[PDB]
């Protein structure tokens, strides 16, 4: 391939009637930089026109649309697929070259494009057109399944996925996607050994993707109160063994190293974690996980001013306006002023899309409690804010009452609101103390403004 | 059928699952395994 690169830039500058020279240029460029492939196709489109005004074969045009698919040029990628299908139609008699099959994969690409338009209606149309004419194909059979997976798991999503194994049980991609469905059901955690054992046949092995999935379903077992019972210690070392195995078979996997750093961070080695995550950090920043795991270390050194910025940097993806666990992992030991009131604003943003959470309404009660005790104790503060303080702690007591009546918690019962209730009662006493001080500061500001009134009369 | 081998031959895969996990740079694991052994030196 490097010698191919050398010969290709031995001939690209040349022209011994170069025709396909750009075709086999870009034919290796698809692994490499895509823009080089674009440029090769660009003059390759021209070069088929001067010797004779010959229409570009649709395999070229489909592939350049395929390039623009991973680029921002989605619309003219669609135009490329349209004119590709037309040129295949212009290959009226070419069942030797099988323009029909080329149209099949072209339509597959165009349906994948309609998915990028989020035109899932026409994506459904193209997919069912292909499957009604070539039902032996699997990728269309499961992208349809993936589309309904975006709607949900127990749809015909899961059933297209299972029948994709029924048409092809040898198919590792679909078979992986079977257990990918089961990632939604984490209560089907220990059951995933079987549904990720089926193609641990060694024809499929080695499957890095699946064995990292084993490591991941093995790590979600952690953060339980049974580590002291050596159970999660064994789980940590078993995940470590998986990670050593994927380490030896691949040094350059990055999700592996994320897994090693995660399990050792669960082992309490957080100074020993930011380094290993730093490696995958330069390797590629575009892994959503490592953004979180680094800031967990930062807040473990209480480095909030290094952490929350990178949290909202993780929020710079076009995925979800209020991801819940990220603002949870944001509001952890947040103790300064913006770490209190803007913390409340973040909790309100989360609560706006997630008013169902008991933990979130507990945590807003907690942060309201913190800001209430921040304004009534050594304060000696404004009238209006301590007037808001009594209302906000009253609200906090409403949530203390409300959550305590609820049974289910985050597997830790929140009768801890009761000591908050004794607190807020003594906070009522303190507020009745300090509101008198508020009236005192009001009357003294009245007397000093009288004192300036008299002297300005004197002037 | 003939369509299956007819399509899977003529297309190409430049983007698979497995090399997503593998990093596009060169991040070896000796440094990783060295600190793996180093934490074992604390053990």
């Amino acid at each position: 391939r490097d010698i191919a690169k050398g010969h290709l830039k031995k001939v690209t500058e040349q022209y011994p009637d170069d025709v396909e020279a750009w075709i086999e240029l870009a034919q290796i460029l698809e692994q490499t930089d895509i823009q080089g492939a674009l440029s090769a196709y660009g003059t390759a489109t021209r070069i088929l026109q001067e010797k004779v005004q010959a229409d570009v074969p649709p395999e070229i045009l489909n592939n350049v649309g395929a390039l623009h698919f991973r680029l921002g040029n989605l619309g003219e990628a669609k135009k490329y697929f349209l004119a590709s299908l037309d040129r295949a139609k212009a290959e009226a008699e070419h069942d030797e070259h099988y323009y029909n099959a080329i149209s099949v994969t072209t339509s597959y690409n165009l349906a994948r494009l309609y998915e990028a338009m989020c035109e899932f209606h026409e994506a459904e149309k193209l997919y069912k057109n292909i499957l009604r004419e070539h039902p032996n194909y699997v990728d269309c059979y499961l992208r349809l399944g993936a589309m309904a997976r975006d709607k949900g798991n127990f749809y015909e999503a899961s059933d297209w996925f299972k029948e994709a194994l029924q048409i092809n049980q040898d198919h590792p991609d679909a078979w992986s996607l079977i257990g990918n469905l089961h990632l939604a059901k984490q209560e089907w955690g220990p059951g995933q050994k079987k549904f990720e054992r089926i193609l641990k046949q060694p024809s499929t092995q080695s499957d890095t993707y699946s064995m990292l999935a084993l490591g991941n379903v093995w790590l979600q077992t952690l953060h339980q109160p049974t580590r002291d019972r050596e159970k999660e210690k064994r789980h940590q070392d078993r995940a470590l063994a998986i990670y050593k195995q994927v380490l030896r078979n691949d040094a350059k996997n990055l999700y592996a190293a994320n897994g090693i750093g995660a399990v050792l961070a669960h082992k309490g080695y957080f100074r020993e974690a930011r380094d290993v995550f730093a490696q995958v950090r330069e390797a590629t920043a575009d892994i959503s996980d490592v953004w979180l795991n680094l800031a967990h270390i930062y807040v473990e050194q209480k480095q909030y001013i290094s952490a929350v910025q990178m949290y909202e940097n993780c929020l710079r993806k076009f995925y979800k306006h209020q991801n819940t666990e990220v603002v949870l992992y944001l509001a952890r030991a947040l103790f300064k002023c913006g770490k209190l009131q803007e913390c409340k604003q973040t909790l309100l943003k989360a609560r706006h899309v997630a008013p169902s959470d008991t933990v979130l309404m507990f945590n807003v009660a907690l942060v309201l409690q913190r800001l209430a005790t921040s304004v009534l104790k050594d304060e000696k503060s404004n009238l209006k804010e301590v007037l808001n303080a009594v209302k906000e702690l009253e609200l906090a007591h409403r949530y203390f009452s409300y959550l305590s009546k609820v049974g289910d918690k985050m597997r830790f019962d929140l009768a801890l609101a009761a000591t908050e209730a004794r607190q807020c009662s003594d906070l009522l006493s303190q507020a009745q103390y300090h509101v008198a001080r508020a009236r005192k500061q009001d009357e003294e500001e009245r007397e000093l403004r009288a004192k300036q009134e008299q002297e300005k009369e004197l002037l | 059928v003939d369509v299956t081998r007819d399509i899977v031959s003529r297309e190409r895969v430049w983007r698979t699952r497995t090399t997503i996990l593998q990093s596009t740079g060169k991040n070896f694991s000796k440094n990783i395994f060295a600190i793996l052994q180093s934490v074992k030196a604390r053990e």
Binding site: Y108, L183 | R10, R12, V13, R17, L21
Partner: peptide, 25 residues
């Protein structure tokens, strides 16, 4: 205050799905 905010802190790890690059004839 007396204790920090509660969380089920986990160093989770996500997986990319299958890419399905548009094909190259």
């Amino acid at each position: 205050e007396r204790s920090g905010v509660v969380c089920r802190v986990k160093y989770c790890n996500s997986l990319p799905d299958i890419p399905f690059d548009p094909k190259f004839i």
